RNA sequence: ACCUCGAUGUUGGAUCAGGACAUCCCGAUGGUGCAGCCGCUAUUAAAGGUUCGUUUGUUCAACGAUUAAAGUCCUACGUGAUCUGAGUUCAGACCGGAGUAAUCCAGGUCGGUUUCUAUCUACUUUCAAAUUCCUCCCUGUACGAAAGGACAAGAGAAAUAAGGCCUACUUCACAAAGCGCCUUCCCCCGUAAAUGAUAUCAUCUCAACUUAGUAUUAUACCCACACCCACCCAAGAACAGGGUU
RNA sequence: UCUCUUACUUUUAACCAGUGAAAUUGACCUGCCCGUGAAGAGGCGGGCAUAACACAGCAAGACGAGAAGACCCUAUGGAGCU
RNA sequence: GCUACCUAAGAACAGCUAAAAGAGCACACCCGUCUAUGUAGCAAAAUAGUGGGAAGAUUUAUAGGUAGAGGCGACAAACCUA
């Protein structure tokens, strides 16, 4: 029968680096070709509407750095770097669920040797290197964006609450006290094998247990959505987002940041680019860092109280 | 939960583990070839790399001398390590101690492996040599490379 | 980056936790630059109050930045045996406590049982910082030049 | 954190905390939803077998960043209504209690040193 | 714990004949360019391994016969030889350990 | 004494909760022997809490300090194949009594072994749309003779539970936790009132209708059928999950 | 001991190699609610429920396993004490 | 021959304080008040300390005697080969 095989099996000692360099140059050229999407064949841009939404971005959680404001308080911001972010395809309204349109957005770039055949065919037909994960954002109809455009981290501006969701750090099969937070029996008070036992689970008259009973098992290996994350600083050169609070997940992982749907922040994106921030048609160069009117800039000459 | 933590436990604690690793390192310095489980030979190679580095850093240093006297319980291996294995890798940095995997043992059927230093007066182990540069795929790759070189 | 300053004010120990990078900090001034035999003075809470008591209106002494930073080899006594932490354990590695006028020989003999001679020769746990130091030094030089 | 049954030392110049007694004054209740007391909270202190309120002016655990860390639990006595008991406070009082200015106006006025 | 009844042979068959407990068929078995005694991917051949182990054992026997007693460890490198083969010029300071058989084709 | 002496473990407490109102509260009404904050009556609503302690052996019972409360019943007087017997179901003894003695005590006390490898059903994040206290201008205003203090709105600080983090505090270190940090968004049916005949007045309607008077036919994680020897991993019991340019 | 638990090592825990139990078993193709019955139903009536098969943990039920109950009662069946 | 008692000949108890002692701490030794582990276990009665004694009412090697309507008993109806 057919045995297992990979890409560097039937290659000599002078062909593996050649193939690596060739595929590296190929993916670099493919990434550089999709740099100016506005000069090609862009879709018509529609004005901003109060009853519409937009597409989010995909970032990578670097680390967590402290941050101070002007009033003297100390906050905490999380670094979200956007390496490569593009649009895969576009699904119409009458093809998904008949409610809202969707957009396929991929994460960072990877290799073409550890992917499925259909994935490679799709990324070859589209013209972009394969990605790690694929996310879907629910948008409206007038926010239709042509697939194949670069998405930078400058799409968000300091002064907007966003929502970041990712896969949390899994704890595996753990006990119930560390999972659900149940109290435990005393220690050396004559206890005989019951320091971390839940005890009862149900009653004697029902003859069974309820499915909604908190019992030990796997916990942490799931995606959690975080709400109320205000941005305080937007970077342009390195494309770093400074979201306040914590991001559910570990370090060096792909997240999914988008606009918030809370009722307190309904129509607050009128001063924001509804389609996508294009560095070609803006006719202006944004600064390296975009600060807020409340965060203490590093170049401050020692703020003093009066 | 053991995230980002190595240090594979073997004996009855850290002291026994360090003693076993020191014995394995002494045996590897002496015989230059030892068959043992994959974790044991991996830790032995990881410690032997730093041992070779410290022996190459110098001889008159008291720190390296104390480390060699501690990690070698045979005494006679210290001059050998300082006057043979140190001048040998004077042109190399951290590229040595090649690890090769063997099948299993005829006793309890455990995964083992054999490591050794470079050079080695003993005959070399049968290295998994790759395919020759004359097969169909290799010839096609060479032709494509020559074509892209002549077209550039 | 934070640091704790120990000082006795009117017979009361006050420990402030400043920040090296905080917008509220005005100016950091060094009064007396000197080293000691320990890199962590957390054992001053169980010592005599006269050692951790310094004058608040003292005049800073000025010297040249080429004296190799003189190290003050001064030993500090300790209060009886209701201490805060077990400083006699070998894992702390403290060479600034007078164990001759505070503890007996049997206490030291029974405390030396937790000594780990194998930890000093762990090798793999050693953090060799050289290339990273050179890189950050080149970076700070390039940032200071232009 | 000053909870309950804690041997605290009075740092006031009154006739209750400065008087010697065979039992050290210990707290029995904290006027808060939880059983955790920080600097600037009202607690009940039993001095010489009595029931009098107290005010936490400095515990021993490090709270935030810009805050002092005293080695001993400093507590200034207080009555029901806002009238302090002692008249001379020799121990230093942190500047974190000056953000009130309404319920502890006399306690901050009878103090001396501030850190 | 104590069962109230008895498991059937059908339950035993469903438990022991499931594909999860059955041994999986591996597809990593190939041939070897040399000798050829049925090897496996990422695993060295047992035939050449036994050969080199026997050769190393013979070399160690010869070294122990030349050294004699324990606690030696010379401060110079070593080099093994076979039938004939005069020592080269760059092998003067190395210990010479000659054997009593022809030189194999897999040792250069 | 109706299955249960070829065996139904008996009071509490720790952990875990489910259901019900004959409801302490925040949600919404009418009256008052309701002058305003303190009270009572009758209705709908269970999404939660029901504290910190002492001693007596307690589910009983006694006393100190809070807010809206330290609520009730059933679940084998819930839960000993999870935990302890402080007594309650023995063999010893002491005090007092009945008894010739032996012996006994719903009279009291000292201590009095707590055994099971999960066979079967069933479980192993149900992904989520919280609750509330205080203060500030109104507030010292209606009100009494005086004490005193709101109805409602805006803003700022806070308590329990849930969803995450190590970079700043701690446990002490190539990691993981809290003592540190962020967020938690919608209601729930009982009245107050126009026109109208039956019943030409009047009539809020188990008539045909109009206002608070129904939130919602809500929104985000996650939705590519197959390259898999081997190595690594913030993924993990195996398996499974991700990367190897 | 707790508020509020936590950082590590061993036994032990999960898989690989073999010797390999004990108690226990009427047969099981073995889900839930309401109601009934020798009075507490996975096998009875009406409904809800349903492709099949293993691994890793807890006890709610099968009035689960060990002792023809030591507590209450019968026996013209016994024995000890006075 | 384990255990209650008796008989004849022997052995054992570092060190310090030794108040003269059926004195104290404390090795070896005699017994086992409590915690933790298992109750088809190492064991049909185990594992460390917290324990009392350890110059004498102490322990032990050898040999003999007291047996059921009885032996023995510093009296537990305790022991008389699980
Ligand atoms: Mg606990
Ligand atoms: Mg225990
Ligand atoms: Mg037990
Ligand atoms: Mg092991
Ligand atoms: Mg302490
Ligand atoms: Mg009956
Ligand atoms: Mg019965
Ligand atoms: Mg039965
Ligand atoms: Mg039974
Ligand atoms: Mg009701
Ligand atoms: Mg209590
Ligand atoms: Mg009960
Ligand atoms: Mg039960
Ligand atoms: Mg039990
Ligand atoms: Mg007792
Ligand atoms: Mg199972
Ligand atoms: Mg069953
Ligand atoms: Mg096995
Ligand atoms: Mg019938
Ligand atoms: Mg029933
Ligand atoms: Mg049945
Ligand atoms: Mg019977
Ligand atoms: Mg009769
Ligand atoms: Mg008879
Ligand atoms: Mg008869
Ligand atoms: Mg008789
Ligand atoms: Mg006797
Ligand atoms: Mg004596
Ligand atoms: Mg004694
Ligand atoms: Mg008697
Ligand atoms: Zn071969």
Q: Give the residue extent of every domain in chain B.
A: 10-120
Q: Which helix (H) or strand (E) holds E78?
A: strand E78-81
Angle at B20 between CA B16 and CA B25, to 5 degrees: 145
- Asked whether B117 and B97 are in contact (CB, 8 A), the reply is yes
Q: Which two tokens stand for residue A279?
A: 């560095």
Q: Residue B13 gets which letter from DSSP?
A: S
Residue pair D107/D11 in contact by the 8 Å Cβ criterion: no
What is the C-alpha to C-alpha distance for residues D57 and D72, in angstroms, rounded to an integer?
A: 11
Q: Enumerate residues 6+ apart whose C-beta is below 8 A from A105.
A: A55, A56, A57, A58, A85, A86, A87, A88, A134, A135, A136, A137, A151
Please check whether strand H approaches the CB of A188 to within 7 Å.
yes
Taking the C-alpha atoms of residue C143 and residue C133, their distance in angstroms, rounded to an integer, is 15
Chain C residues with CB inside 8 Å of D92's CB? 9-10, 12, 14
**Interface contact C121-B47, CB threshold 8 A:** no
Q: Closest nucleotide to A192's CA, by C1' atom?
A: F83
Instruction: Strand G: list positions under 7 Å from protein Cβ.
Output: 1-11, 16-17, 23-33, 40, 42, 52-65
Q: Is E35 among the annotated ligand-binding positions?
A: yes
Which chain A residues contact residue E28 at CB under 8 A? 3-4
Q: A3 in contact with E at a CB cutoff of 8 Å?
A: yes
Euclidean distance between CA atoms E51 and E57, whole angstroms: 10
Question: Would residue E73 count as lying in a domain?
Answer: yes
What is the Cα–Cα distance from D62 to C83, expressed in whole angstroms? 19
Sequence-ordered alpha helix ranges (H) in chain A: 16-33, 93-96, 117-126, 176-179
How far apart are the C-alpha atoms of A198 and A297, rounded to whole Å? 51
Chain-centroid distance, C-alpha B8: 17
- With 0-12 CB in 10 A as exposed, 13-18 as middle and 19+ as buried, what is B131? middle
Residue indicated by tokens 């106006």: D105
Using CA atoms, how far residue B38 sits from B32, B68, B101, C113, D1, in Å, is 17, 25, 8, 34, 51
Q: Do chains B and E touch (3 or more CB pairs under 8 A)?
A: yes
Domain count, chain D: 1
Number of domains in chain C: 1
Alpha carbon distances (Å) from A279 to A35, A37, B49, C53: 10, 10, 50, 61
C118 to chain B: nearest residue by CA? B15
Resolution limit, Å = 3.0
Per the CB < 8 Å rule, is C4 touching D69? yes
- Domain encompassing residue C37: 1-144
Nucleotide nearest residue D63, measured CA to C1': F169
Q: Does the nearest atom of strand F lie within 7 Å of C57's Cβ?
A: no
- Return d(Cα D3, Cα D17) in angstroms, integer: 19
Contact C17 D74 (CB under 8 A): no
- Residue E4 resides in a domain: no
Helix (H, G, I), strand (E, B) or coil at C17: strand
One-character DSSP codes across C27-87: ----S---B-S-S--GGGGGS-TTTS---TTPPPP---TTS---B----B---SS--SS-T
Residue D92 CA to residue C13 CA, distance in Å, equals 10
Q: Is residue E78 one of the residues assigned to a domain?
A: yes
Strands of A92-201 (E only): list them: 101-106, 134-139, 161-167, 172-174
The CATH homologous superfamily to which domain B10-120 belongs is Ribosomal protein L17 (3.90.1030.10)
Which of the nucleotides in strand H have any atom less than 7 Å away from a protein CB atom? 35-38
| A305 closest CA partner among D66, D63, C2, C29 | D66
- Is the CB of A190 within 7 Å of strand H? yes
Kindly report the CA angle at C108 between C106 and C114, in degrees rounded to 5? 120
Concatenating the DSSP letter of every residue in A215-249 gives -SEEES-SEEEEEEEEEEEEESSS-EEEEES--SS
In a domain, E21, yes or no: no
Nearest to D40 by CA among D73, D75, D11, D65: D75
Q: What is the helix (H) or strand (E) element at residue B31, kind and residue range?
A: helix B14-31
What's the rounded Cα separation, in Å, for the pair A239 and A277?
A: 13
D19, D22, D24, D30: CA torsion to nearest 10: -100
Experimental technique behind these coordinates: cryo-EM
* Chains in contact with D, counting 3 or more C-beta pairs less than 8 Å apart as contact: C
Of the candidates C104, C29, C45, C125, the residue with the CA atom closest to the CA atom of residue C79: C45
Range of the domain at D70: 1-115
Any E CB within 8 A of B4 CB: no
Q: How far is A199 from chain C (nearest CA, A)?
A: 38
Q: What are phi and psi of C42, to 5 degrees?
A: -80, -5
DSSP string, B33-70: -EEEEHHHHHHHHHHHHHHHHHHHH-SS-HHHHHHHHH
Contacting C with CB below 8 Å, chain A residues are: 68, 70, 72, 296, 300, 302-304
DSSP letter (8 states) at residue E104: P
DSSP string, A252-276: SEE-EEEE---GGGSS--TTS-SS-
The answer to whether E14 is a known ligand-binding residue is no
Judged on CB neighbours under 10 Å (0-12, 13-18, 19+), A240 is: buried
């Amino acid at each position: 029968g057919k045995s297992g095989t990979w890409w560097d099996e039937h290659l000599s000692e002078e062909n593996v680096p050649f193939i690596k360099q060739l595929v590296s140059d190929e993916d670099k050229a493919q990434l550089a070709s999709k740099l100016c999407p506005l000069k090609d064949e862009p879709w018509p841009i529609h004005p901003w509407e109060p009853g519409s939404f937009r597409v989010g971005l995909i970032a990578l959680k670097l680390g967590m750095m402290p941050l101070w404001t002007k009033d003297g308080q100390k906050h905490v911001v999380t670094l979200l770097q956007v390496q490569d972010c593009h649009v895969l395809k576009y699904t119409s309204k009458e093809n998904c669920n008949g409610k809202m349109a969707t957009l396929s957005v991929g994460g960072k770039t990877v290799s073409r040797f550890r992917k499925a055949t259909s994935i490679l065919e799709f990324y070859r037909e589209l013209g972009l290197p394969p990605k790690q994960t694929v996310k879907i954002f629910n948008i409206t109809d007038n926010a239709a964006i042509k697939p194949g455009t670069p998405l930078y981290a400058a799409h968000f501006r300091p002064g907007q609450y966003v929502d970041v969701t990712a896969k949390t750090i899994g704890k595996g099969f753990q006990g119930v006290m560390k999972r659900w937070g149940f109290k435990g029996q005393p220690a050396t008070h004559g206890q005989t094998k019951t320091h971390r036992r839940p005890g009862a689970v149900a009653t004697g008259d029902i003859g069974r247990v309820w499915p909604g009973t908190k019992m030990p098992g796997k916990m942490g290996n799931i995606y959690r959505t975080e709400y109320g994350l205000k941005v305080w600083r937007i970077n342009t050169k390195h494309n770093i987002i400074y979201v306040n609070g914590s991001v559910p997940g570990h370090k060096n992982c792909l997240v999914k940041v988008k606009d918030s749907k809370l009722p307190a922040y309904k129509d607050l994106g009128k001063n924001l680019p509804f389609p996508t921030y294009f560095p070609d048609g803006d006719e202006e160069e944004l600064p390296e860092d975009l600060y807020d009117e409340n965060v203490c800039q590093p170049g401050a000459p020692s703020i003093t109280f009066a | 939960i053991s995230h980002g933590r190595v240090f594979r436990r073997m004996g009855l604690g850290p002291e026994s583990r360090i003693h076993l690793l020191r014995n394995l390192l002494t045996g590897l310095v002496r015989h230059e070839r030892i068959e043992a489980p994959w974790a044991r030979v991996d830790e032995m190679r990881g410690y032997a790399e730093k041992l070779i580095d410290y022996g190459k850093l110098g001889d008159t240093n008291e720190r390296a001398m104390r480390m060699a006297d501690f990690w070698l319980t045979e005494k006679d291996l210290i001059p050998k390590l300082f006057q043979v294995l140190a001048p040998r890798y004077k042109d190399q940095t951290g590229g040595y101690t090649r690890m090769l995997q063997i099948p299993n043992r005829s006793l309890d059927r455990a995964k083992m492996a054999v490591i050794e230093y470079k050079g080695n007066c003993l005959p070399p182990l049968p290295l998994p040599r790759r395919d020759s540069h004359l097969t169909l795929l290799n010839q096609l790759l060479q032709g494509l490379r020559q074509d892209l070189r002549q077209s550039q | 980056a934070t640091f704790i300053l120990r000082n006795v004010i009117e017979g009361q120990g006050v420990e402030i936790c400043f920040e090296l990078y905080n917008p509220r900090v005005q100016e950091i001034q060094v009064v007396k630059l000197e080293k000691r035999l320990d890199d962590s003075l957390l054992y001053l809470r169980d010592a005599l109050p006269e050692y951790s008591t310094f004058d608040v209106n003292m005049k800073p002494v000025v010297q040249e930045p080429n004296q190799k930073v003189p190290v003050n080899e001064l030993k500090v006594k300790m209060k009886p045996k209701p201490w805060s932490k077990r400083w006699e354990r070998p894992n702390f590695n403290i060479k600034g406590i007078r164990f001759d006028l505070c503890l007996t020989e049997q206490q030291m003999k029974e405390a030396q049982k937790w000594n780990q001679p194998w930890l000093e020769f762990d090798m793999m746990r050693e953090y060799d910082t050289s290339k990273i130091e050179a890189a950050i030094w080149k970076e700070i030089e390039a940032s200071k030049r232009s | 954190a000053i909870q309950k049954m804690t041997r605290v030392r009075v740092v006031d110049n009154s006739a209750l905390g400065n008087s010697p007694y065979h039992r050290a004054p210990r707290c029995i209740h904290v006027y808060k939803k939880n059983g955790v007391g920080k600097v600037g909270d009202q607690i009940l202190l039993a001095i010489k077998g009595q029931k009098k309120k107290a005010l936490i002016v400095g515990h021993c655990m490090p709270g935030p960043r810009m805050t002092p860390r005293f080695d001993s639990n400093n507590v200034v006595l207080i009555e029901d209504n806002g009238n302090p008991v002692g008249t001379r406070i020799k121990t230093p009082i942190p500047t974190s209690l000056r953000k009130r200015e309404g319920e502890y106006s006399k306690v901050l006025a009878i103090a001396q040193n501030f850190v | 714990a104590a069962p109230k009844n008895r498991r059937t042979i059908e339950v035993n068959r469903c438990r022991r004949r499931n594909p999860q407990k059955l041994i999986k068929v591996k597809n990593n078995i190939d041939v070897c360019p040399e000798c050829g005694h049925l090897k496996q991917k990422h695993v060295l051949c047992a035939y050449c391994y036994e050969k080199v182990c026997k050769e190393t054992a013979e070399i160690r026997r010869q070294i122990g016969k030349q050294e004699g007693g324990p606690f030696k460890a010379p401060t110079i490198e070593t080099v093994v030889l076979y039938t004939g083969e005069t020592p080269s010029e760059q092998d003067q300071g190395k210990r010479i350990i000659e054997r009593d058989r022809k030189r194999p084709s897999w040792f250069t």
